[PDB]
Amino acid sequence: SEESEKLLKEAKEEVRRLFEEGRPEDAARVAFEFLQRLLDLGDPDAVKELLQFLRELL
Structure with a gap:
């Protein structure tokens, strides 16, 4: 629901910020x-x- 929607955006922005730093x-x-x-x-x-x-990020 809303909680899945919030966690999903948080997942995207955290795994991207971890990838862009190393x-x-x-x-x-x-x-x-x-x-x-x-x-x-x-x-x-x-x-x-x-x-x-x-997958697109890699």
């Missing part, structure tokens, strides 16, 4: 943590959107 492995741990959250929230569209957001 840490290719810290940025991926935070994405994997955020993917599982949104999964358990029951929002597969939010995990699908985050995954597409990440």
